[PDB]
Amino acid sequence: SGAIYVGNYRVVNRHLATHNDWANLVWEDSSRDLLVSSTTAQGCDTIARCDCQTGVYYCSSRRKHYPVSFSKPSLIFVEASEYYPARYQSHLMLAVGHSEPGDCGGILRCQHGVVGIVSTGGNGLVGFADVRDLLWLDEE
Ligand SMILES: Cc1cccc(N(C)C(=O)N2CC[C@H](C(N)=O)C2)c1
Ligand SMILES: [Zn+2]
């Protein structure tokens, strides 16, 4: 579990969105595993606006933050899970790092701010859903 809180937005994995998230929906995209809902209180996270390929992510199944090198956002094949059939997920970045199913939500960050959130993984891989292209998170 985990979310990004920027301005009056809450960014979560679409497959973990709550009823309150769907009832206060701003935007969702199944192909990216992302959903954004509105919040009453203002958040403290800042979104990175960069092309960094190194950063640090939070792994809840180890209670640790790990430095990682990650790929550029791309269209990657993902294997079936309890939440999605085997399919191509867009704007996904891969890194080598421990990950387990309930780690989705953990933040990946660089020197500029939040880069994305854990969305996939397994066998020593960890996949991140990128948010750096969502410029509208910075306003209104
Ligand atoms: C972090 C982790 C570790 C091992 C496996 C995973 N996967 C395979 C997983 O639970 N899902 C559920 C939906 C997600 C997706 N974005 O398609 C894939 C994640
Ligand atoms: Zn950066």
Curated annotation (Swiss-Prot):
<feature type="binding site">
    <location>
        <position position="52"/>
    </location>
    <ligand>
        <name>Zn(2+) 1</name>
    </ligand>
</feature>
<feature type="binding site">
    <location>
        <position position="110"/>
    </location>
    <ligand>
        <name>Zn(2+) 1</name>
    </ligand>
</feature>
<comment type="subunit">
    <text>Homodimer.</text>
</comment>
<feature type="active site" description="For protease 2A activity">
    <location>
        <position position="15"/>
    </location>
</feature>
<protein>
    <recommendedName>
        <fullName>Protease 2A</fullName>
    </recommendedName>
</protein>
<feature type="binding site">
    <location>
        <position position="50"/>
    </location>
    <ligand>
        <name>Zn(2+) 1</name>
    </ligand>
</feature>
<feature type="binding site">
    <location>
        <position position="112"/>
    </location>
    <ligand>
        <name>Zn(2+) 1</name>
    </ligand>
</feature>
<comment type="function">
    <text>Cysteine protease that cleaves viral polyprotein and specific host proteins. It is responsible for the autocatalytic cleavage between the P1 and P2 regions, which is the first cleavage occurring in the polyprotein. Also cleaves the host translation initiation factor EIF4G1, in order to shut down the capped cellular mRNA translation. Inhibits the host nucleus-cytoplasm protein and RNA trafficking by cleaving host members of the nuclear pores. Counteracts stress granule formation probably by antagonizing its assembly or promoting its dissassembly.</text>
</comment>
<feature type="active site" description="For protease 2A activity">
    <location>
        <position position="104"/>
    </location>
</feature>
<feature type="active site" description="For protease 2A activity">
    <location>
        <position position="33"/>
    </location>
</feature>
